[PDB]
Structure 1
Amino acid sequence: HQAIAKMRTMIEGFDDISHGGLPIGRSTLVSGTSGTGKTLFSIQFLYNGIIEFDEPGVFVTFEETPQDIIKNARSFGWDLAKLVDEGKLFILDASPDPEGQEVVGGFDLSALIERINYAIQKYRARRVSIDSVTSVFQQYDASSVVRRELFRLVARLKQIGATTVMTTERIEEYGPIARYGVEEFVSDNVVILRNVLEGERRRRTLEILKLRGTSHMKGEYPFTITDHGINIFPLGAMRLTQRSSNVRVSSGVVRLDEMCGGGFFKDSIILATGATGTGKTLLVSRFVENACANKERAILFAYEESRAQLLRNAYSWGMDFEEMERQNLLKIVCAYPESAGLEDHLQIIKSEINDFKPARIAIDSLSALARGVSNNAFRQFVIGVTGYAKQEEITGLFTNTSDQFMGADSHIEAITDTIILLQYVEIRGEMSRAINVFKMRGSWHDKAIREFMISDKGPDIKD
């Protein structure tokens, strides 16, 4: 069992799906529709190679000028002009001009490969890419001709030895792998970038169709475009090896801690589900407050309420959130669910965690995030967040909405370690409330369903 050597491509998450990067000396065909990030993948591949591994490279372009390639890259802070000046990056301009608008013949790949070979030797390139192969095959439309011409191109690049990422377009999502349907059978490594429209939403995903001679994660995985270009989330690449101790932390409510058998486990995920107005946001406020009381950092993620309202509600319950922010212990992040896809909310949660390094986090509402979201997309989000929170040993508190007043869902409860239910009880013409610890993995919990009140001192559970 001799593994094939790979060239690591530090596009976050890609090296996990490709399971070690792209095979060395092989061509990779990246296909997708317009606006799927195909041109970003190509730049990011060369850029990372040049700065991380000091590997010179060549970007061949047919449909853009070097000036826009650089200008667009600069939106990511990727100063490609600098890398060009230093002789690390070379952009090979093979684009058509408005000057000399048309020619008598067609594109010459023999001339092209000679220029690429030269550029590779001159800059000692090991890593190369092509923005559009079809820009050549705008002529030579016969599928039998395209197959041969692509074969020749790939074979020559293989002899040179540079690892190549070449790009092609397709028209339809879930349609043919590539235009003419004779390209994907020539290339050794094929990657699909799609941007699926469902309902009114677009979702970017990445899939590796095949890698000849090597293993890879199979199927479709989500990705987004963020501060450093492409950021892929290979859900399932994380391991189910998270630590689990008997260390406990206070919930912020003394009687609840007793009902929980002495407090929440530090490494647990807690879900507080109940009817609207039963105090879900009260327990969340006390959860992050307790962290700060013990000089621990905590992040409150609000998907319903603005910061101004959270501060006001907290004051009415005796909690000075503004003071906790002044001490740099509490941080509040507010957004509408509709502002971003769930894969971005996941990136936001992770980024805020990496920067603030909290002991605890809380999500004010999962039901806010699930609005208009399919069970698959929502479920993946919840798994990703709780998986990460466990991995980093961050105590996590999430809330949700129960169907108490609605007739006629529990697919994330298998992830949650502790479940607390908040419900209304109508007693003799008055509304009241009751709390119960429904589930508690690893510990005793009170089976009783107990009445509680909410006042300006916060929740107060009675026996």
Structure 2
Amino acid sequence: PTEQSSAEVKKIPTMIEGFDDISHGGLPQGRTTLVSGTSGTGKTLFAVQFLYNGITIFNEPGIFVTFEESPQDIIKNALSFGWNLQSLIDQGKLFILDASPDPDGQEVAGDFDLSALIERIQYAIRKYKATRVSIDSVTAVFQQYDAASVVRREIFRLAFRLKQLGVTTIMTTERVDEYGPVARFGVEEFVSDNVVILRNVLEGERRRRTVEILKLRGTTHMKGEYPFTINNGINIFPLGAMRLTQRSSNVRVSSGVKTLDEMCGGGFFKDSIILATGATGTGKTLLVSKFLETGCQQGERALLFAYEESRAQLSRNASSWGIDFEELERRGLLRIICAYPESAGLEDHLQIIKSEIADFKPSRVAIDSLSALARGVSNNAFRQFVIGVTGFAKQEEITGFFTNTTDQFMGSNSITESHISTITDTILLLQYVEIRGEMSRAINVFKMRGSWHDKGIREYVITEKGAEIRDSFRNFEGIISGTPTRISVDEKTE
């Protein structure tokens, strides 16, 4: 059960978060891997992290060859991630080779004599006993006056003699267009055993970082683009490798509303995702406030992500329901993260949610309006976002509370117009009901995945005491229409 052999192609772990999953183990040992991308896309970082993680986790000496940036500038830039390459240079584990051109000529005639640096790189590998090599900005060395034929053979020589020395290599190349050729000369990608493509695409004034493994000769890999973020190095979150393997339990928590707990047969599940959906002014934010307030009353932390209202505006409205966000914040039981949805990409939004959750370590998490985050973005990006947040919440055993404002008050025949209701364990439906020329409100627990729930579409009023849930309209027809018909006949009472 390995099985069916063989020696074949094995991989060297990069320990870049999420990469070893999409590469099914890492980079092919003893081979050169081509990392391609446009400006400021993370190539230069990819090569350094490949060396840095090899030295401090596997004790494998590395050599970094630079043709543009100075050695001191590479060391200085890496300090932003909290690691210093100088100590490794001092220990003799890391060697930064300056192949950068002297600010004068000449010139030469094919520029470099080659052979050495190929001897230079060779000499460095011998001296420091290195197994990993990163060559940064290979493209820059070519542009003197080189047809695609010369560039093809030159990469081949480099890759070949580095293959002799049994060294895994990362080669960095530049792109101009985001979806055109893989490289600048449209040839490098064919001569390379392995090709990784780093992309920085627009999409409506927001930016999105994606990584893709185009080909790994002699082995397997995940295919397509994958979202990543620059943070503590390269942070790839495979949207699919997040194993559909989270726990579950029959433990219950309260909503803060007594009747709503009875309606859910004892309250929400600790291991659940709750969706409060309905028109505007219905009371989605009120239920969020009570859901968080109860956690604090238990001594556990609550974390709120608001995208529509500010803290002072949230604290004012909440106070009118008797609850004090102000005091709960300064004690460290409640944290309110207010941000504009359009301020960053949904991938960047996801990082902040993860980071804040890890820092604060809450037992309850609420997002005021997922629908607010769904504006101006593709449904694919948004649905991908929800999976990320929903899955990560279920993974950390944190109770999730999400709200969704429907664009359609009265007569909405859909729970959510972005269709994410299949990712949620619990759905609370809120809607307007027209009773005698006045706008009433009704609440319905649409579904409880692991529980019995009340079936009634029950009227509720909002007061200082909060949500007062009452009886269902038992003499009306077409309540979910929003416009009921009173049918007190047949009177059926003699």
Q: TM-score range by the shorter chain?
A: over 0.9
Match of 2:52 among 47, 60, 64: 47
Q: Quick one: distance in 2 between partners of 1:444 and 1:24?
A: 55
Q: Quick one: distance in 2 between partners of 1:406 and 1:182?
A: 59
Q: 3-state DSSP class of the match of 2:456? A: coil
Does 2:423 correspond to 1:415? yes
Q: Quick one: distance in 1 between partners of 2:457 and 2:165?
A: 73
Q: By how many angstroms is 1:187 displaced?
A: 1.2
Structure 1 residues 410 and 12 mapped into 2: Cα distance closer, same or farther (>3 Å)? Answer: same
Does 2:455 correspond to 1:451? no
Q: Quick one: distance in 2 between partners of 1:12 and 1:285?
A: 35
- Check the 8 A contact 1:196/1:202 in 2, yes or no: yes
Q: Quick one: distance in 1 between partners of 2:180 and 2:164?
A: 32
- Check the 8 A contact 1:109/1:153 in 2, yes or no: no
Q: Quick one: distance in 2 between partners of 1:339 and 1:101?
A: 49
User: Which residue of structure 1 aligns with residue 285 of structure 2?
Assistant: 281
Does 2:74 correspond to 1:69? yes
Q: By how many angstroms is 1:358 displaced?
A: 1.5
- Superposition TM-score, scaled by structure 1 size: 0.96
Moved more, 98-107 or 76-85: 98-107
Does 2:333 correspond to 1:329? yes
User: Which residue of structure 1 aligns with residue 42 of structure 2?
Assistant: 37
| Alignment deviations for residues 217-270 of structure 1 (CA, whole Å, 9 cap, x no partner) | 1111111112x1221111000111222222111111111111112111111111
User: Which residue of structure 1 aligns with residue 200 of structure 2?
Assistant: 195
* Alpha-carbon RMSD: 1.7
Match of 1:270 among 246, 252, 274: 274
Does 2:461 correspond to 1:461? no
Structure 1 residues 407 and 196 mapped into 2: Cα distance closer, same or farther (>3 Å)? Answer: farther
Q: Quick one: distance in 1 between partners of 2:287 and 2:106?
A: 69
- Check the 8 A contact 1:27/1:165 in 2, yes or no: yes
Q: By how many angstroms is 1:340 displaced?
A: 1.3
Structure 1 residues 370 and 121 mapped into 2: Cα distance closer, same or farther (>3 Å)? Answer: same
Letter in 2 for 1:179: R
Does 2:121 correspond to 1:116? yes
**1:55-454 correspondence to structure 2 within 5 Å:** 55-100=60-105, 102-139=107-144, 141-226=146-231, 228-405=232-409, 409-454=417-462
- Check the 8 A contact 2:193/2:217 in 1, yes or no: yes
Q: By how many angstroms is 1:106 displaced?
A: 2.3
Q: By how many angstroms is 1:406 displaced?
A: 8.0
Q: Quick one: distance in 1 between partners of 2:269 and 2:211?
A: 37
Aligned residues: percent identity?
82
Q: By how many angstroms is 1:288 displaced?
A: 1.1
Moved over 6 A (4+): none
- Check the 8 A contact 1:107/1:139 in 2, yes or no: no
Q: Quick one: distance in 1 between partners of 2:142 and 2:299?
A: 63
| Alignment deviations for residues 386-439 of structure 1 (CA, whole Å, 9 cap, x no partner) | 111112211101000123338982521111111111112232333221111112
Structure 1 residues 214 and 365 mapped into 2: Cα distance closer, same or farther (>3 Å)? Answer: same
Aligned length, in residue pairs: 462
Q: Quick one: distance in 2 between partners of 1:105 and 1:411?
A: 59
- Superposition TM-score, scaled by structure 2 size: 0.90
- Check the 8 A contact 1:140/1:146 in 2, yes or no: no
Q: 3-state DSSP class of the match of 2:134? A: strand
Q: By how many angstroms is 1:105 displaced?
A: 4.3
Letter in 1 for 2:66: T
Q: 3-state DSSP class of the match of 1:240? A: coil
| Alignment deviations for residues 163-195 of structure 1 (CA, whole Å, 9 cap, x no partner) | 111101121111111122211111111101111
Q: Which runs of 5+ in 1 are unaligned?
A: none
